[PDB]
Structure 1
Amino acid sequence: DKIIHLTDDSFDTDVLKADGAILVDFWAEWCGPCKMIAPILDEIAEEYQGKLTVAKLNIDQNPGTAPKYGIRGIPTLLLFKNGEVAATKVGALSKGQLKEFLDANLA
């Protein structure tokens, strides 16, 4: 609903050219930890309305983007502020951990 479903081609516009903070989720369908965090991202998108936007870029459907960010393990969450990576998180984490990751890095 509020999550951006990113593509290779749309990544520049949706992420790099966005005026504000984007939490990008690099994931794949076969990845268990990716799927466990997916409903956590859903809640993050609802609660952080106005502060950031959540966007996902499935790395099998869109194989181009992730190498540019040196992704080598999923899920990886990158936090962008205006096209620039501020904060990197690798592996699954809880809602309370992601929250703390966001709050601390959004400031």
Structure 2
Amino acid sequence: SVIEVTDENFEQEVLKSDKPVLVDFWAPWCGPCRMIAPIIEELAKEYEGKVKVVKVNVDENPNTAAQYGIRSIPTLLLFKNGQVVDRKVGAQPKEALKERIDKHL
């Protein structure tokens, strides 16, 4: 239930989403990215219908990474109707993320 998103479809999937969007920026050789991927997976399940959860491979999608100043991975952005309302980098614990997310819903 986590949507993998590329440069090709970022605008429709994220910017034009009717629901708030959590965007997990990641790349293949990221241990910390691997650490929170199942955490990101559970979030989509628990926020289903309320928050959309997506992932973006920064290695293969450098254009979106550049547009939103992704300086490191994993980087989590919360989108609310086309704009960034929260930002968080690093492997974050699930309940801490839900705490951060809940503040913009």
Output the TM-score relative to the length of structure 1.
0.94
Report the identity percentage.
60
Q: Please list every run of 5 or more consecutive structure 1 residues that lacks an aligned counterpart in the other structure.
A: none
Query: Following TM superposition, by how much is the alpha carbon of 1:62 offset from its aligned partner in structure 2, in angstroms?
Result: 1.4
Q: Which aligned pairs between 1:1-107 and structure 2 lie closer than 5 A?
A: 2-106=1-105
- CA distance in 2 between partners of 1:19 and 1:105 (Å): 14
Query: Following TM superposition, by how much is the alpha carbon of 1:19 offset from its aligned partner in structure 2, in angstroms?
Result: 1.1
- CA distance in 2 between partners of 1:67 and 1:96 (Å): 29
Secondary structure of 2:97 counterpart: helix
| CA deviations over 1:10-67 (Å, ceiling 9, x no partner) | 0011011111200011101111111100000110000001210110010112111111
Query: Following TM superposition, by how much is the alpha carbon of 1:85 offset from its aligned partner in structure 2, in angstroms?
Result: 0.5
Query: Following TM superposition, by how much is the alpha carbon of 1:105 offset from its aligned partner in structure 2, in angstroms?
Result: 2.2
What stretches of structure 1 move > 6 A for 4+ residues in a row?
A: none
| Structure 2 counterpart of 1:90, one-letter code | V
